[PDB]
Amino acid sequence: VQETTAGSEEISSATKNIADSAQQAASFADQSTQLAKEAGDALKKVIEVTR
Amino acid sequence: QETTAGSEEISSATKNIADSAQQAASFADQSTQLAKEAGDALKKVIEVTRM
């Protein structure tokens, strides 16, 4: 039970690290998706301008 | 027996996160690579425009 609790404690520690890292990775993925759509909305009025 | 059942579902979850992570890391590499070339080709459209 002590062996198991020690491995369970490691799984828990890792599951927090994955859960905090993914919530910040996702937030930069939604910021990056917005800066791509924005830089696209910019660039198409430079394609319209070059035309 | 309940722990054994749980230890199977943790393995399924571990694998689902490991696969999701690998693929997402591939997509992130493919994404950073095209934002370098798209920006290099835009630092040339700025020179054709200013020309």
Q: Which of A28, A33, A46, A47 to mutate to test the interface with B (most CBs of B within 10 A)?
A: A46
As to burial, measured by CB atoms within 10 angstroms (0-12 exposed, 13-18 middle, 19+ buried), residue B15 is: exposed
When CB atoms are compared, the residue of A4, A11, A50 closest to B49 is A50
**Number of residues in chain B:** 51
In contact, A43 and B42? CB cutoff 8 Å: yes
Elucidated via:
cryo-EM
Residue whose entry in the numeric block shows the structure tokens 């696969």: B19
Please provide the distance, in angstroms rounded to a whole number, between the alpha carbons at the two ends of chain B.
Answer: 75
A4 contacts on B by Cβ (under 8 Å):
3
CA distance B48 to chain A (A): 10
